[PDB]
Paper text:
Nucleosomes are substrates of the protein machineries responsible for DNA replication, recombination, transcription, repair, and chromosome segregation. Single particle cryo-EM provides an alternative way to determine atomic resolution structures without requiring crystals; however, nucleosomes tend to dissociate during cryogenic sample preparation, which apparently limits the resolution of structures of NCPs determined. Here, we overcome this hurdle by using a single-chain antibody fragment (scFv) to stabilize the nucleosome. In this work, we demonstrate that the scFv can be used to stabilize nucleosomes for determination of atomic resolution native-like nucleosome structures by cryo-EM.
We further determined the cryo-EM structure of the free NCPCENP-A, NAS in the absence of the scFv as a control. The free CENP-A nucleosome showed substantial dissociation comparing to the scFv bound nucleosomes. We selected 303,864 number of refined particles and reconstructed a density map at the 3.40 Å resolution, which is insufficient to define the DNA bases unambiguously. We also found that the resolution of the density map only improves slightly (0.05 Å) when the particle numbers were increased from 220,908 to 303,864, suggesting that the resolution limiting factor is particle heterogeneity rather than numbers. Nevertheless, the free CENP-A nucleosome density map and structure fit the corresponding map and structure of the CENP-A nucleosome bound to the scFv very well, demonstrating again that binding of the scFv did not perturb the nucleosome structure.
Residue numbers in the entry:
A (entry chain A), B (entry chain E): 42 to 140
C (entry chain G): 9 to 116
D (entry chain C): 10 to 116
E (entry chain H), F (entry chain D): 31 to 124
G (entry chain F), H (entry chain B): 23 to 102
Amino acid sequence: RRRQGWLKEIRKLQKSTHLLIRKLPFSRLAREICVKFTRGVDFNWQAQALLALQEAAEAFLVHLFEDAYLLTLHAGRVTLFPKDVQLARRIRGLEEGLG
Amino acid sequence: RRRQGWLKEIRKLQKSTHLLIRKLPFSRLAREICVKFTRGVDFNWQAQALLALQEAAEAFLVHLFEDAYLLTLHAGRVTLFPKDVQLARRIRGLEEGLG
Amino acid sequence: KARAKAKTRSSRAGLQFPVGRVHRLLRKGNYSERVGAGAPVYLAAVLEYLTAEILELAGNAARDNKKTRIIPRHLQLAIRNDEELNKLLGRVTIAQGGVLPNIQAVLL
Amino acid sequence: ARAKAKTRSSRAGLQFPVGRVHRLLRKGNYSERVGAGAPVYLAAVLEYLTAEILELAGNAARDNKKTRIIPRHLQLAIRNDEELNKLLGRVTIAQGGVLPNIQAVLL
Amino acid sequence: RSRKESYSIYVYKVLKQVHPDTGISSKAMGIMNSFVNDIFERIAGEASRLAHYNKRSTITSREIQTAVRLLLPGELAKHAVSEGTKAVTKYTSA
Amino acid sequence: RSRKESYSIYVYKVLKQVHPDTGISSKAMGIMNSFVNDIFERIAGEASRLAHYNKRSTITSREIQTAVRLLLPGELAKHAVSEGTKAVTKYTSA
Amino acid sequence: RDNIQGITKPAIRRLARRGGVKRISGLIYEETRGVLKVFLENVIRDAVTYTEHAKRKTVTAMDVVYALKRQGRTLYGFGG
Amino acid sequence: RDNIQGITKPAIRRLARRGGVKRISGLIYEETRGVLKVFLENVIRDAVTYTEHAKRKTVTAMDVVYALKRQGRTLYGFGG
DNA sequence: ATCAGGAAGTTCATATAAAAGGCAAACGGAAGCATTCTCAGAATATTCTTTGTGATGATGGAGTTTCACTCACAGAGCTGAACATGCCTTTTGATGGAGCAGTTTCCAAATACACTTTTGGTAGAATCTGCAGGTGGATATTGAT
DNA sequence: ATCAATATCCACCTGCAGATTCTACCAAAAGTGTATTTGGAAACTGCTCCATCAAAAGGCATGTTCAGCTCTGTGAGTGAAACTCCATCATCACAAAGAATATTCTGAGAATGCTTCCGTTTGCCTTTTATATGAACTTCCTGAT
């Protein structure tokens, strides 16, 4: 016997505000990608830039899954496949879509 | 014994540059929708504005059907339904989508 | 001589936003060469109206959420539950705002 | 007496008018004062992008056996090219048409 | 330390004439402070462009009126225009 | 009739050295004219906000360089920067 | 006969063939007329606003181009 | 262990639940890691460009906000 | 593996609309000199970002079962493209015409400018309170009879 | 249709983080004359959009059929959520520390202002050419065999 709890997890995550990616595995990913653009020079990051970029890199992904799950429900499925996300990034376009 | 002609029609229309809606049935639709915003005063249009607005209104619809037909082929269909256009105007957003 | 005392031109118009500061920002921001004297008066009234438009709905959401002080989620809800503020603040993400509590109806 | 006048376009070796770019940066109200190297830089960048698009459009005209570039050829040249499609992304080119692209499932 | 001015004491006065028993936190003060700086440069950038398309040198009240009417959507640019007009017609009568 | 000046005689000079045996029709000259007037108002607007974020009064070549590097994507920017640096070096020499 | 009914079935069919549509449902011919009216309402409102600010009664080409430019639909070919 | 493997499985699941997703395929944990990398590569490049023009070595919050603002992703709360 | 017949590509001639070319004028870009003034540079305080290092409990990684879900397939029934036929909305074009926008002069009221004085807004203190976690009872699901 | 467990909701206590309130003071906003200039107003012209009429034919509206679909249901098999557990990793505190950002004063090279003069750019007739169009030929591609 196993009860469903996806319905109790979506509701407790839609009424909270806090960030859902842990702070340090994002805080070294951003400093890794920042190396390739400064020609090996390590820039310093402020403590309010690694939050003001995580607040946008999660508000992109949550809205991306909200716009791809409409495509998943459109095809008769319920399971979210990568061919849904790759389509929802194409319909949005060059600007709003990729990147 | 009948034959297909849609594949000959798509190819002969995608290599043309002219306009597909006739000139006068659009030139009176635009002048009717103008009256709802000018408080009964009849504005003049130029002849280069009723083409400048038709060139935009058809390049909107062609790209809308190109974005909706991906949704049609996405659900396993071939036939373009209105529930595809109503979703391609929802994923695009508030600006690029509706209107 | 008998130099008369100052009336602020926020108070000559009855606003709450600073017409002097808005005039200086329109003049220093390089928007045009001259700035007419009715333009900061018009623009400060528009900004006061929109600020009241949002803080009223945010106060109603904070009252509905059994609280006193307005937090950023009480602005997120106030903006996204409204058809003409969601259209204005459309491509705007509001930090610590959360999302709307949406579940698709076919799942339930 | 004065010396012979030399244009800044021919001094920098460009083709776009550095004088007109300087006047349109002053009269446009972008900032208070405008330096002397900014129009020389900006005219060079505008000449480069125009020389890019007029070469892809020339190739698309030559591939269609025509010696004059029509807006169809600019639509083709911009949309077939990966980064000019990303620059001119949200741009409709009038009397331009679409790219020939039939979905391969339908064939 | 530089002076670092803002709209923080004015958003508070507008809050405490529509909800006299309600406070606002620091981060929701910052969000309402960034909202005003956004709509300010949005309306001023539209009215800098109306008066450049038409070969003018002055941002008058009329440019701010039609820039409000372009930017603000629907039944909100019907109230904001009246809120600005009833401020200008009582500024000039003083 | 007014002056009505544009970029139509400069786009043609660029065409006569990227393809020496190829003319261009009138509407496809108006499109290149509109393209130049759009890229100009884009690069100069980004340079004007760059000069205004840092409290400068001057749009030098450095703001135009860091506005090309923000607008133009990919290899197109890295070619345009080296196309402009060559021209301002040749200008400051002569 | 109404004016939106002048956007006929061959016109919507022929725009759909340019977009690449193979078979076209019978209910789409009112959905396309519903979308076109919403687009024309959003563009002609700003065309008339830019006209009225300049004190004219003639909507020139630059006013429609400026109405399209500020919605993110930059139109090349009519002066700009 | 690459650093993009620090965007773990339950964090992607936890973002998709806030997005409202009932069931999640297992192949999406690489598509999401490939979309997040492209979003960060487009925002970090413009933040670094705004830093290098100002002759600094510290990436403030204003640089990130100006990078997000110009891609049409205006961020409120960090100074604007 | 074989023919039929229209579809599409070749190719040469030809009008003709459209692009290239020549010539004047006005206007604006350049040379030159006098003047201001912004900003790169040097010296200095001070803020705040990084790295370590330890403590530690919070949470993700790994593996195994079970059942809701995706996918291919077949068959019934709807429906959309194809075809025949008439006829009616588009289109050209054409001149009259009259509402209208672009041009030119003049001047007056609104806008800047410079100086002095008051005054409100920000920064830095002391001080008061909303709320988040905690503890514990009433109540609205979720089975399983 | 009914009893236990449980998840939800709520009633209340309080520590403290954070909002509120209280003060020097400084920049900046406002009042007062001065001067300059932008733009609303009127006259006028020449451009240009609306309206109408005849026609003419081409494209659209309507009916009908049939074959290519959409939809629903079924069953096989795949695969994702639930569950346990513990050890790895992120969080926090913190003393310092030290690079790098922020502030301040200086003068010089770069930018502006003004005058003159001359060379570029655009506008309007004039030719000359590329491209649409026609018309027959030839291939060739698709349905049939």
